[PDB]
């Protein structure tokens, strides 16, 4: 009867930020004690909601989005932020209600000689809407000269990979990020905390 938070936080595999995973959670009691009892999270930021209210309140659905970014990009997973990740990969709404959790995963997501599996979108015509997931791989026309679906002049593949090496600086090391979103629609709420 417990919510599958372990399935998200302890997942062996993590998605690239541009193709971020979303886990819909419903019909369970949510044990948030396991989360803030830990000391392994370098980031734990809550907007519009608190662990006390998390303990008592109930929500129609809660979403757990997870992905991997580098160290100094974690500041971009927040309302009203700009940058490659916020604008082109994962945007949070200005009225975001939820919590952002991130921890260093240099031990897992970095490989000797560099781990290039994790991708991010470097180029996009416009900014992502909140909670938008763009998995397009079309060539990006940076200028006026057209790209005929090919690597023409000023035309580039939009997705580029992090070069995650174990010896990278902290701001460039891989960080696993989990974003919890809590929505309360005008319908019976199936996600409840222990204090209810």
């Amino acid at each position, epitope marked *: 009867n417990l919510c599958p938070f372990g399935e998200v936080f302890n997942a062996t595999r993590f998605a690239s930020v541009y193709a971020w995973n979303r886990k819909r959670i419903s019909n369970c009691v949510a044990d948030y004690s396991v989360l803030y009892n830990s000391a392994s999270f370098s980031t734990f930021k809550c907007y519009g909601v608190s662990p006390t209210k998390l303990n008592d309140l109930c929500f129609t659905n809660v979403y757990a989005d997870s992905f991997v970014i580098r160290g*100094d990009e974690v500041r*971009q997973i927040a309302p009203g932020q*700009t*940058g*490659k990740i916020a*604008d082109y990969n994962y945007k949070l709404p200005d009225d975001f209600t939820g919590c952002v959790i991130a921890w260093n995963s240099n031990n897992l997501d970095s490989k000797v*000689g*560099g781990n*290039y599996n994790y991708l991010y979108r*470097l*180029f996009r015509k416009s900014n992502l809407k909140p909670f938008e997931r763009d998995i397009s791989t079309e060539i990006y026309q*940076a*200028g*006026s*000269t057209p790209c005929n679906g090919v*690597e023409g*002049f*000023n035309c*580039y*593949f939009p997705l*580029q*990979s992090y*070069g995650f*090496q174990p010896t*990278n*600086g902290v701001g*460039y090391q891989p960080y696993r990020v989990v974003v919890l979103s809590f929505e309360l629609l005008h319908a019976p709420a199936t996600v409840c905390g222990p204090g209810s």
Partner: antibody, heavy 117, light 108 residues
Framework: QVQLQESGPGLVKPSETLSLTCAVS?????????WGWIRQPPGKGLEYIGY????????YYNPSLKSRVTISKDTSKNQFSLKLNSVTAADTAVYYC?????????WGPGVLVTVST | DIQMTQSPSSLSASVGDTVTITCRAS??????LNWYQQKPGKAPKLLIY???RLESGVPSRFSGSGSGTEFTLTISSLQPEDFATYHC?????????FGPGTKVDIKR
């Protein structure tokens, strides 16, 4: 965590071939991104030379410099080169190797190459 | 070749001032404009791309605007570290073209 380092002599005679090498550390060139060269004559503005795709090798050159310039990625050394034929006093400049041509975000410190007899 | 020019080309200002640098193109380049900061003995550093998008890690006092053939760079609350040479770049046509550069120095 990606660093660029130019290498090569600052000693080239007129009508000879200038040869420079950019050493990339912290990221494998062939894995991704695009890489190129920029130069700046002392006391003048910057000039674009060319760039290539790490993954595919697709190469582009400044039309005013074509037929003189060649950029190639070395095999099994993670570096790319610049070759400029028949240099003149107009080719004396500080030469930079840079990443992401459209928006040059990462630069090498630059090496001054003086063309003289 | 699209020719890029910078109007000020030299100016002096004091810490805490606001300055505006103008860069023009010989023809329409939409918003395919980059702004760079170069200090002596150093490579340029990217500041603004797409003529308004401020790069990550750059203070918000830098701002770019413009479209077509005219663009401007604005620096508010000038700080000592902001004094350097600034360049503009167009990526609309096959030869990437930079401006001549504009040098800002401390008023005294």
């Amino acid at each position: 965590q990606v660093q660029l380092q130019e290498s090569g002599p600052g000693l080239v005679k007129p009508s000879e071939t200038l040869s420079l090498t950019c050493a990339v550390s912290g990221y494998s060139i062939s894995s991704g991104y695009y890489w190129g060269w920029i130069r700046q004559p002392p006391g003048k503005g910057l000039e674009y030379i060319g760039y290539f795709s790490g993954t595919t090798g697709s190469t582009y050159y400044n039309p005013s410099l074509k037929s003189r310039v060649t950029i190639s990625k070395d095999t099994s050394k993670n570096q790319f080169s610049l070759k400029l034929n028949s240099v003149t006093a107009a080719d004396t400049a500080v030469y930079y190797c840079a990443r992401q041509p459209p928006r040059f975000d990462v630069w090498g410190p630059g090496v001054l190459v003086t063309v003289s007899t | 070749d699209i020719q890029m020019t910078q109007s000020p080309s030299s100016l002096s200002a004091s810490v805490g001032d606001t300055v505006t640098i103008t860069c023009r193109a010989s023809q329409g380049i939409s918003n395919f404009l980059n702004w760079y900061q170069q200090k002596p003995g150093k490579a340029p550093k990217l500041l603004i791309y797409d003529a308004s998008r401020l790069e990550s890690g750059v203070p918000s006092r830098f701002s770019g605007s413009g479209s077509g053939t005219e663009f401007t760079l604005t620096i508010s609350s000038l700080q000592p570290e902001d004094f350097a040479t600034y360049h503009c770049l167009q990526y609309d046509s096959d030869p990437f073209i930079f401006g001549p550069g504009t040098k800002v120095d401390i008023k005294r």
